[PDB]
């Protein structure tokens, strides 16, 4: 499919991240993420050997929590996510990370009505990604076929 971080170390990937940018071919998805003030993501190991990715965002007076189970897909750093509301499964890959500052993720539909869906995600360890990491994300999005108009930095969904 796409590249996975070589020698991936899942335990170094755990803990607190911030969703700092995204690109997708779904316009409603980009627009809604951009509109949301999101708070942390937290990555913790799941019982199946994969990860629970728990994201938080603000709506009105409250911080909502959402947890996605990323099941192991058979190479370290690659997962599968099943979305019952969308009747679809997606591949999720950690394409590149240095563990201590940033991670570049790529997701694509694999089965179901969501098969055509594609999304790149920037995770940062801080809420203020440096310029060089924003430029790395833009260049990673372009390597995946995303046009500039499809690339969103999350000001404080971040």
């Amino acid at each position: 499919q796409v590249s996975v971080q070589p020698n991936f170390q899942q335990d170094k990937f755990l803990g607190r991240w911030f969703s700092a940018g995204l690109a997708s071919n779904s316009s409603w998805l980009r627009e809604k993420k951009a509109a949301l003030s999101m708070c942390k993501s937290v990555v913790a190991p799941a019982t199946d050997g994969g990860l629970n990715l728990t994201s938080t965002f603000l709506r009105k007076n409250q911080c909502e929590t959402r947890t996605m189970l990323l099941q192991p897909a058979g190479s370290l750093g690659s997962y599968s996510y099943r979305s019952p509301h969308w009747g679809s499964t997606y591949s999720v890959s950690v394409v590149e990370t240095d563990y201590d500052q940033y991670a570049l993720l790529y997701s694509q539909g694999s089965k179901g009505p969501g098969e055509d869906f594609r999304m790149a995600t920037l995770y940062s360890r801080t809420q203020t990604p440096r310029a060089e990491l924003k430029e790395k994300f833009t260049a990673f999005c372009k390597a995946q076929g995303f046009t500039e108009d499809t690339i969103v930095f999350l000001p404080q969904t971040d």
Side-chain angles (χ1 to χ4, degrees), residues 1-115 117-158:
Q1 299 306 130
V2 153
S3 303
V4 173
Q5 168 65 40
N7 199 29
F8 179 71
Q9 303 292 321
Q10 186 172 270
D11 61 307
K12 293 183 167 189
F13 186 68
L14 301 183
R16 180 178 66 190
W17 290 100
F18 300 92
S19 60
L22 88 63
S24 180
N25 60 350
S26 170
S27 62
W28 69 250
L29 185 280
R30 285 190 316 265
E31 291 163 359
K32 176 66 51 177
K33 298 304 190 180
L36 253 44
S37 30
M38 133 168 215
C39 308
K40 50 196 202 145
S41 297
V42 181
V43 174
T47 310
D48 70 358
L51 291 173
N52 280 313
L53 207 164
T54 296
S55 299
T56 56
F57 66 93
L58 179 69
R59 192 195 282 124
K60 197 173 171 184
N61 300 123
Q62 69 202 65
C63 182
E64 284 302 311
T65 302
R66 302 293 180 256
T67 295
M68 286 169 73
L69 172 69
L70 303 188
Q71 302 173 241
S75 297
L76 303 180
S78 80
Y79 303 92
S80 64
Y81 172 62
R82 181 61 182 177
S83 172
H85 294 174
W86 291 96
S88 295
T89 294
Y90 305 79
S91 168
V92 180
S93 296
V94 184
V95 178
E96 182 178 317
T97 180
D98 72 348
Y99 311 103
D100 296 335
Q101 297 303 339
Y102 72 92
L104 307 182
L105 269 67
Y106 179 75
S107 297
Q108 63 177 182
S110 50
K111 188 166 283 195
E115 243 185 293
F117 178 72
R118 307 185 312 121
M119 178 172 69
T121 303
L122 172 63
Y123 282 103
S124 50
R125 286 293 194 179
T126 71
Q127 281 195 94
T128 52
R130 58 199 294 167
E132 296 98 326
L133 172 61
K134 291 157 82 176
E135 293 182 42
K136 167 176 283 295
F137 183 63
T138 292
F140 170 70
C141 286
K142 286 183 53 147
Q144 301 289 279
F146 292 107
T147 60
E148 205 96 67
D149 33 76
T150 70
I151 299 168
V152 168
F153 289 94
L154 308 170
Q156 221 58 258
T157 145
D158 158 325

